[PDB]
Amino acid sequence: PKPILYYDERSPPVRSCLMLIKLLDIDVELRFVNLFKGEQFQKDFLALNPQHSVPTLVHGDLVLTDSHAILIHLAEKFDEGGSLWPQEHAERMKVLNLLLFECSFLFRRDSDFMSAIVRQGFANVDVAHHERKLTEAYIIMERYLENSDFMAGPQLTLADLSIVTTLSTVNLMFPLSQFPRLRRWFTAMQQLDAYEANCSGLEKLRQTMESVGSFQFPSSSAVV
Amino acid sequence: PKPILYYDERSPPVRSCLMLIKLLDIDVELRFVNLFKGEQFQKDFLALNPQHSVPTLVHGDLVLTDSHAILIHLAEKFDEGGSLWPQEHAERMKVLNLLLFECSFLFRRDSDFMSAIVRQGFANVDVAHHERKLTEAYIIMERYLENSDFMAGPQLTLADLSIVTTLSTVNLMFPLSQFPRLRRWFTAMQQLDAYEANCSGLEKLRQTMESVGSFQFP
Numbered sequence: 001p002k003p004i005l006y007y008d009e010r011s012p013p014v015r016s017c018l019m020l021i022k023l024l025d026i027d028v029e030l031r032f033v034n035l036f037k038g039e040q041f042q043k044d045f046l047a048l049n050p051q052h053s054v055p056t057l058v059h060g061d062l063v064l065t066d067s068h069a070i071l072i073h074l075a076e077k078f079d080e081g082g083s084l085w086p087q088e089h090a091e092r093m094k095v096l097n098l099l100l101f102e103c104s105f106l107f108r109r110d111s112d113f114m115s116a117i118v119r120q121g122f123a124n125v126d127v128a129h130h131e132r133k134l135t136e137a138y139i140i141m142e143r144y145l146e147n148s149d150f151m152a153g154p155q156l157t158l159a160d161l162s163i164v165t166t167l168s169t170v171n172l173m174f175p176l177s178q179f180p181r182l183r184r185w186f187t188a189m190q191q192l193d194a195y196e197a198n199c200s201g202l203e204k205l206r207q208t209m210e211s212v213g214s215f216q217f218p219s220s221s222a223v224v
Numbered sequence: 225p226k227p228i229l230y231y232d233e234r235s236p237p238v239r240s241c242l243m244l245i246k247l248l249d250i251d252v253e254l255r256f257v258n259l260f261k262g263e264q265f266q267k268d269f270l271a272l273n274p275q276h277s278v279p280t281l282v283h284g285d286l287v288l289t290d291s292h293a294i295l296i297h298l299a300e301k302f303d304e305g306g307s308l309w310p311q312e313h314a315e316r317m318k319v320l321n322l323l324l325f326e327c328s329f330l331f332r333r334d335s336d337f338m339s340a341i342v343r344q345g346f347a348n349v350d351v352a353h354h355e356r357k358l359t360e361a362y363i364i365m366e367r368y369l370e371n372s373d374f375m376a377g378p379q380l381t382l383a384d385l386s387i388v389t390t391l392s393t394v395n396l397m398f399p400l401s402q403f404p405r406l407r408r409w410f411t412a413m414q415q416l417d418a419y420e421a422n423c424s425g426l427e428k429l430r431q432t433m434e435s436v437g438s439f440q441f442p
């Protein structure tokens with residue numbers, strides 16, 4: 001039975017899974033869950049995933065409710081032996097470490113910022129506070145890229161797929177002018193055929209956020 | 225060379241690593257980084273871990289900056305063939321899925337609440353708001369425990385070690401009396417010899433929070 005992905009492409013973690021699915025040419029059934037309308041609280045979806053979150057993957061009996069587990073599972077089943085989720089223990093641990101950075105730091109802070117916009121309206125958000133917190137994430141990623149060409153080493157890994165979607169979302173608001181390594185890396189990610197899977201949901205998120213938050217992202221910020 | 229763990233045992237994720245180290249008899253060099261004094265910001269540690277977070281593990285050339293990577297790494301290096309980090313793919317994915325629940329949901333929400341105390345003062349925290357957020361996490365774990373004795377299945381895994389330390393920290397404020405499966409699970413975890421590794425840091429966190437929060441837990 002082929003994998004089933006419950007998804008809303010506005011979510012950066014969803015887009016990371018879509019990028020991997022395109023990159024590896026995985027045949028997956030897509031089932032849309034509209035987060036803006038609250039469909040993640042439908043009784044049947046809640047029973048499947050009590051965290052009421054996307055992405056959620058159903059693959060046979062296996063139910064995964066975190067993008068980072070979905071990325072690892074799909075890499076192991078469809079990029080077996082490959083370099084996205086590298087074979088050598090230390091290289092694999094490096095990728096895992098950066099996946100968890102994305103979960104615990106970059107996504108956490110972007111989520112905090114974007115949900116404050118939705119709850120309060122942009123005009124009432126402490127933007128300087130969130131600018132400091134997300135600039136710190138930029139600094140950390142710049143450090144990682146000062147030591148290696150991609151996030152977790154010399155070649156593309158799951159860490160880049162996980163991080164680039166949330167980075168592109170942060171960068172709707174906050175420019176990368178002061179971060180040359182992160183700009184070079186982001187530009188390189190944008191040249192990948194798989195990055196096409198990030199573009200549509202990023203734009204839909206931009207539209208939804210501007211509407212719900214009553215504001216406009218500065219057009220000059222996003223690297224394009 | 226033996227692993228080096230940079231730690232402050234007030235941190236629940238740190239305590240999860242301490243529990244695994246005791247559980248597996250890992251010879252580790254502990255290096256205390258006093259988070260209350262901001263030692264995670266001095267130049268050499270920042271250069272080591274720009275996230276300025278504990279636990280941080282240095283094992284040869286490998287530098288891990290997240291408790292869940294540290295748990296997996298130590299289980300793979302020191303408990304190959306064990307049930308804590310099971311080899312079968314579906315079981316391993318299930319443990320991984322719960323480790324990420326701890327990171328993304330349970331710890332995130334407990335960190336939100338505790339941060340609010342430190343930043344705003346306990347007297348100014350919207351306790352009802354955080355009670356709702358953390359009770360939702362209790363509800364989810366109760367569902368996870370519906371038909372299995374542990375978080376990720378019939379046996380103790382890394383997921384239980386990760387979750388129990390944060391759970392004990394949430395439980396400083398919010399009791400478990402309404403969640404029968406979760407309360408029984410927690411009592412069972414407290415019977416593990418390895419759980420002794422959680423006790424000191426939990427008490428030190430309580431004391432530090434009550435001092436800085438200018439308050440006193442229930």
Ligand SMILES: Cc1ccc(C(C)(C)C)cc1S(=O)(=O)Nc1ccccc1C(=O)O
Nearest residue numbers: 010011012035036110111114115118205208
């Ligand atoms: C991850 C995510 C999914 C869906 C959305 C929209 C439906 C708003 C387009 C936004 C985001 S987001 O990355 O911008 N973060 C939030 C923003 C607002 C509210 C909640 C969150 C959250 O993460 O829970």
Ligand SMILES: Cc1ccc(C(C)(C)C)cc1S(=O)(=O)Nc1ccccc1C(=O)O
Nearest residue numbers: 234235236259260335336338339342429432
């Ligand atoms: C990460 C951290 C930093 C500083 C502290 C001291 C209170 C000891 C200064 C504790 C922690 S902690 O690791 O002990 N957990 C939290 C406790 C309070 C607020 C936030 C957190 C959190 O992690 O977010």
Ligand SMILES: Cc1ccc(C(C)(C)C)cc1S(=O)(=O)Nc1ccccc1C(=O)O
Nearest residue numbers: 072076092096296300311312313316317320
């Ligand atoms: C199914 C399996 C069997 C044997 C192994 C090893 C011999 C490599 C331990 C690994 C796996 S696994 O494909 O499920 N592995 C990981 C999953 C999540 C995070 C890290 C790993 C990892 O391998 O380090």
Ligand SMILES: [Cl-]
Nearest residue numbers: 076080081082
């Ligand atoms: Cl593989």
